[PDB]
Design a protein around this ligand. Sequence first.
Ligand SMILES: Cc1c(NC(=O)c2cccc(C#N)c2)ccc2c1c(C1CCN(C(=O)C3CCCC3)CC1)cn2C
Length: 230
Amino acid sequence: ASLTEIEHLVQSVSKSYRETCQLRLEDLLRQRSNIFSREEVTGYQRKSMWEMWERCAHHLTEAIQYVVEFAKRLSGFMELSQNDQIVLLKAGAMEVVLVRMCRAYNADNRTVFFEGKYGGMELFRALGCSELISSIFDFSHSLSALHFSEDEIALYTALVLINAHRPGLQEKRKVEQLQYNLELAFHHHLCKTHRQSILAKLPPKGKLRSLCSQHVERLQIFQHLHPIVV
Ligand SMILES: Cc1c(NC(=O)c2cccc(C#N)c2)ccc2c1c(C1CCN(C(=O)C3CCCC3)CC1)cn2C
């Protein structure tokens, strides 16, 4: 593929991300000073695991929507079979939500944006899954260290979604081609921005997949005991 085709793909993913980023980076950064008081923290910690489950499920479904919209705006995604689209989204939408979380994470105080303010992992005490929440905080902490640009997130999360290795892909060669184009797009933009160094610093492919697997397992248990309608 020619260099203008690669650049166009970079511009496209970058534009698709801008339109589906949920909140602008500037807004998240600004609101870092808007932190929960000790009383608000105590408020959340006193809630039952069921009220906390409802609040986290509401936040995660709002997050998944923007990711679904992001995927729909990706070059060649709509062209795939409904089965192949679903295979890609069921496997990768939650992995993208985990990557996008680094933008609303503040490494200075180890806080996250949740329900209009910033709070530490102590906010999620009532859920009773401190190991899982501590692992999600660790993953966001390691990505925050990379100081990802908005276009770097766009390209990386596009590559999380467009994966030819997903079990159950019918049109596997189409997906292999789209993944190949996006990989040239990602390498090209990193060279143009003098950021090829981040490639080494990225999480091992298995890390994201394993953390998402753990997260979803926990959400499935909560769904079985206390279902929530979309
Ligand atoms: C909320 C959040 C953000 N905020 C955002 O991503 C955010 C919020 C509002 C606009 C935008 C935007 N744009 C981003 C960023 C980093 C985060 C989190 C969290 C939560 C996630 C939800 N929770 C769960 O699923 C538990 C896990 C077990 C079952 C329920 C508890 C832990 C952890 N870290 C590291």
